[PDB]
Short mmCIF file of C-alpha atoms in Angstrom, two decimals:
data_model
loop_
_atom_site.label_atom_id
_atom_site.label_comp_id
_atom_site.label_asym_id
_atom_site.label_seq_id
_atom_site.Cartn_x
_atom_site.Cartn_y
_atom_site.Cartn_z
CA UNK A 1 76.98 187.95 245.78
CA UNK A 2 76.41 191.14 247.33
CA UNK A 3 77.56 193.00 244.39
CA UNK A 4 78.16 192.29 240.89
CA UNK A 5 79.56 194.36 238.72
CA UNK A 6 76.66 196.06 236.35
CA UNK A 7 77.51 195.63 232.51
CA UNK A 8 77.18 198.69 230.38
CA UNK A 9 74.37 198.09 228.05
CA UNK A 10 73.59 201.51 226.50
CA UNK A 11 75.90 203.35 224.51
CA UNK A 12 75.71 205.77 221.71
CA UNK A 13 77.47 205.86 218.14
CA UNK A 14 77.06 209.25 216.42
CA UNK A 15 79.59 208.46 213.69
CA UNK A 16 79.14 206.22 210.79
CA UNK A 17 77.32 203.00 211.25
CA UNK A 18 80.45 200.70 208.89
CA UNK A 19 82.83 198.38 209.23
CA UNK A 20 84.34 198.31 205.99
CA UNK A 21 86.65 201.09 204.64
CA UNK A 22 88.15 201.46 200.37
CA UNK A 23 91.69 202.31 200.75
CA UNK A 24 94.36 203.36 198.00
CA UNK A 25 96.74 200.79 197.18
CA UNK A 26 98.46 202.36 194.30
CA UNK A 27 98.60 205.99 193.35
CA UNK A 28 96.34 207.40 190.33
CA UNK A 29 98.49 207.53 186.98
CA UNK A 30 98.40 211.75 187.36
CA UNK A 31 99.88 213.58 185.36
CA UNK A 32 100.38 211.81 182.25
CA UNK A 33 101.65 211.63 178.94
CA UNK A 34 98.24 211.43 177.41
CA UNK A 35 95.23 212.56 179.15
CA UNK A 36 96.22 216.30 180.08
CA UNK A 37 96.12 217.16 183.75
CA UNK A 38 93.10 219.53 183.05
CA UNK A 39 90.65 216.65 183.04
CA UNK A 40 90.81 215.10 186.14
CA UNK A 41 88.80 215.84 189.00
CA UNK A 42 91.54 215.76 191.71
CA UNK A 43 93.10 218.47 189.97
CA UNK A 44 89.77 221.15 191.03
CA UNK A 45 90.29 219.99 194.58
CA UNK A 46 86.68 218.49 194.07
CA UNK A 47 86.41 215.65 196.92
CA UNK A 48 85.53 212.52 196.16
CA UNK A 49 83.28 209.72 197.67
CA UNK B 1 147.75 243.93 129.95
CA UNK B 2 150.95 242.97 131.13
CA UNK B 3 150.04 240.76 133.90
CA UNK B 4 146.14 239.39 134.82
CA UNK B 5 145.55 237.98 138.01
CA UNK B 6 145.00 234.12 136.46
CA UNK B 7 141.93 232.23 138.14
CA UNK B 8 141.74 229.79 140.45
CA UNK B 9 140.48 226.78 138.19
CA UNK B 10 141.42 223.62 140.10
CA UNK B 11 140.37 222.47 143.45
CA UNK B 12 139.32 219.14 145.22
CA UNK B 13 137.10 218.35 147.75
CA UNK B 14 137.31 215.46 149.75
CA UNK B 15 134.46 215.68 152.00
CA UNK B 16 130.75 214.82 150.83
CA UNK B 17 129.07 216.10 147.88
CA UNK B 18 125.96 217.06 149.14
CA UNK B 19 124.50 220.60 149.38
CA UNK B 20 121.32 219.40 151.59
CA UNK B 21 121.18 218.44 155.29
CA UNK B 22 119.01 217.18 157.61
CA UNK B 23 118.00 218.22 160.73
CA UNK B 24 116.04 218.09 163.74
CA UNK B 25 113.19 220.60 164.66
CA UNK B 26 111.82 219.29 167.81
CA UNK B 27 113.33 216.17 169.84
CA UNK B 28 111.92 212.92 170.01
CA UNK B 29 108.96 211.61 172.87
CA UNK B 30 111.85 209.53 174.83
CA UNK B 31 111.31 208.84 177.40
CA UNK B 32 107.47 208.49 177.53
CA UNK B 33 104.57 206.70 179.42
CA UNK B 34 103.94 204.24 176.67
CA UNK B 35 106.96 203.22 174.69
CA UNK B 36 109.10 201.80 177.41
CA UNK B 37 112.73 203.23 176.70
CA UNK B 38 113.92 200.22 176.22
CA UNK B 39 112.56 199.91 172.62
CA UNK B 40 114.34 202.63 171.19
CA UNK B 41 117.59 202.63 169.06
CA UNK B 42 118.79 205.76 170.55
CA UNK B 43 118.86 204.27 174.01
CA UNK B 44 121.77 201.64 173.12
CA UNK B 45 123.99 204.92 171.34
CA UNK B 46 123.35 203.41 168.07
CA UNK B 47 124.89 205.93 165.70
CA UNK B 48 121.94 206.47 162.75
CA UNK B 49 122.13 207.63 159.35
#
């Protein structure tokens, strides 16, 4: 009565504002018999999105 | 004049009579990303012609 806890109402997020996240389940099919390692992207170390 | 070495006229051969073989340059694609293994001859030791 004389003192109640005071909830926190502000609070900051500098990150991403997400919930949902795309995950790898299985591996790309690199290298291969067929298309030569020399096309894919992943094998510049260009980072994907 | 006396004596001439005589030739050699007669002789057998048992073996084949073929003067012609076959053979292999560069090996086959096994094992490979498409053909499972399982499909070719080779992988049971069947002897070919």
């Amino acid at each position: 009565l004389l003192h109640a806890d005071t909830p926190r109402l502000v609070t900051w997020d500098a990150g991403l504002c997400t919930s949902f996240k795309i995950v790898p389940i299985v591996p790309a099919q690199v290298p291969q018999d067929v298309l030569a390692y020399t096309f894919f992207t992943s094998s510049y170390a260009i980072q994907s999105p």
